[PDB]
Amino acid sequence: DHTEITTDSLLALLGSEKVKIIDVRSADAYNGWRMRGEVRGGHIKGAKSLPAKWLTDPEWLNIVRFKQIRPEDAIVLYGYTPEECEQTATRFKENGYNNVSVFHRFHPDWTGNDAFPMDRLEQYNRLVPAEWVNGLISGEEIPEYDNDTFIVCHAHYRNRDAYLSGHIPGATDMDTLALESPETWNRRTPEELKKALEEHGITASTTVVLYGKFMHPDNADEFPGSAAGHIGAIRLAFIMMYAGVEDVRVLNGGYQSWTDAGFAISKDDVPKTTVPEFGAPIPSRPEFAVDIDEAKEMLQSEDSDLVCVRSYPEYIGEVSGANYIKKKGRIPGAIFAECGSDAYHMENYRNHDHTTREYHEIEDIWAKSGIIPKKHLAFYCGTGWRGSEAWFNALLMGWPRVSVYDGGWFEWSNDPENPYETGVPK
Numbered sequence: 001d002h003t004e005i006t007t008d009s010l011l012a013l014l015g016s017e018k019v020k021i022i023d024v025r026s027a028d029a030y031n032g033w034r035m036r037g038e039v040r041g042g043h044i045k046g047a048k049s050l051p052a053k054w055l056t057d058p059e060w061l062n063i064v065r066f067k068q069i070r071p072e073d074a075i076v077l078y079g080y081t082p083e084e085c086e087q088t089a090t091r092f093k094e095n096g097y098n099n100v101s102v103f104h105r106f107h108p109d110w111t112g113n114d115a116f117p118m119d120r121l122e123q124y125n126r127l128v129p130a131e132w133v134n135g136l137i138s139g140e141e142i143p144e145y146d147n148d149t150f151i152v153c154h155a156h157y158r159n160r161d162a163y164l165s166g167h168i169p170g171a172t173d174m175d176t177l178a179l180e181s182p183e184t185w186n187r188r189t190p191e192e193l194k195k196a197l198e199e200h201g202i203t204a205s206t207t208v209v210l211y212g213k214f215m216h217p218d219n220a221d222e223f224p225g226s227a228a229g230h231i232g233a234i235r236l237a238f239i240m241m242y243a244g245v246e247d248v249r250v251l252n253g254g255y256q257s258w259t260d261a262g263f264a265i266s267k268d269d270v271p272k273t274t275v276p277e278f279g280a281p282i283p284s285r286p287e288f289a290v291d292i293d294e295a296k297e298m299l300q301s302e303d304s305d306l307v308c309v310r311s312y313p314e315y316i317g318e319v320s321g322a323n324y325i326k327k328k329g330r331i332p333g334a335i336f337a338e339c340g341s342d343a344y345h346m347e348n349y350r351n352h353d354h355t356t357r358e359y360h361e362i363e364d365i366w367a368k369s370g371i372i373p374k375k376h377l378a379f380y381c382g383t384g385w386r387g388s389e390a391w392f393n394a395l396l397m398g399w400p401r402v403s404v405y406d407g408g409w410f411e412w413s414n415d416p417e418n419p420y421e422t423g424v425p426k
């Protein structure tokens with residue numbers, strides 16, 4: 001049996017540093033999705049996200065410690081129901097956490113009274129849960145959807161087997177080579193983008209739902225990006241939003257979220273349904289893309305910064321990151337925001353199930369380095385993949401001036417006239 005905490009007691013503890021309020025619902029509900037039809041979505045202000053889904057992860061206890069949840073803390077759990085928290089509460093006590101309570105009245109008591117403060121990811125509806133995609137493809141009535149034309153796009157890099165081995169029913173595949181050039185690894189020209197989108201069946205008023213499949217990329221392989229399909233999906237989300245597709249969504253966690261939800265997959269090679277006209281000028285959102293001239297200006301500007309989203313070995317010039325990148329080093333003056341272990345993983349921006357990391361954690365880490373929304377930020381990496389996923393996260397927070405410096409280290413280091421640093425920074 002677990003101690004219950006009351007709505008009155010919890011309100012009195014919202015500012016306490018020894019209390020940890022923990023939301024055990026899905027990360028999508030935490031971000032704002034009204035998964036039970038609640039009028040106010042999101043989480044209790046100050047709450048951390050610890051989906052009960054993660055209880056089967058053998059590294060669950062390390063996830064808790066990585067989140068700085070300590071046995072000395074007073075732990076308060078809540079879900080859609082107090083029964084959601086039963087297994088989480090037991091797990092905490094089994095591991096030395098002795099001050100554990102459950103808040104039974106989150107929904108509808110906390111959600112249904114405007115005096116109880118809540119928080120949410122400001123643009124959460126661009127990061128969709130698997131159930132929303134399911135309702136969309138099934139024709140059901142879904143929230144955050146007022147359109148009549150949609151397309152589910154399975155993204156991959158020169159690896160149609162990632163799609164053919166299993167995809168969301170009805171979805172078509174988009175190779176990333178369709179929207180970015182193998183010469184520069186930058187977005188293609190507007191004329192090419194228009195034709196590529198028309199040929200995949202996408203207009204500017206189509207709701208595009210992008211996802212990819214994670215297939216454990218290996219640095220030994222000639223094309224590790226063929227296994228990092230959901231980064232590629234978010235890369236294509238960047239390019240489509242830059243081009244002018246008004247409603248682009250990303251399935252949170254990619255393909256794993258679809259199968260984790262127990263939904264049926266397909267292996268059909270769905271043929272494309274061309275559309276004659278994209279229906280808008282390209283690019284409609286040029287401010288999302290930054291090129292090297294503007295990137296050099298942003299380095300000299302106080303109002304702006306470049307944000308290096310690469311690994312630490314790349315940052316110190318120990319490796320180039322990719323086998324087509326010649327020079328090792330970093331762009332001087334950029335702010336480091338370590339992506340993860342290498343050029344094809346995003347561990348610092350992702351949970352183990354590949355859903356986006358708790359956005360408050362991304363926010364506080366970014367703020368510790370002066371990465372803040374009042375600036376104009378251009379995220380970049382090797383060629384713009386990882387920078388797109390970083391950019392997308394900031395966009396989801398409603399940050400007003402965030403861009404991707406497309407050329408990245410590849411374009412920067414290809415010009416020997418450009419300066420660069422190496423080694424551990426002094």
Ligand SMILES: C[N+](C)(C)[C@@H](Cc1c[nH]c(=S)[nH]1)C(=O)O
Pocket residue numbers: 157176185223224225226321322343344381382383384385386
């Ligand atoms: C598809 N791509 C443009 C050829 C890149 C994408 C990428 C991911 N990480 C880095 S660096 N580049 C790759 O797969 O290396």
Ligand SMILES: [Cl-]
Pocket residue numbers: 035131132135142143
């Ligand atoms: Cl729903």
Ligand SMILES: [Cl-]
Pocket residue numbers: 221222223224226
């Ligand atoms: Cl390969």
Ligand SMILES: [Cl-]
Pocket residue numbers: 212213214215227228229230231232
């Ligand atoms: Cl991925």
Ligand SMILES: [Mg+2]
Pocket residue numbers: 014015016017018019020021046
């Ligand atoms: Mg607290």
Ligand SMILES: [Mg+2]
Pocket residue numbers: 184185186187382383384406407408
């Ligand atoms: Mg690029």
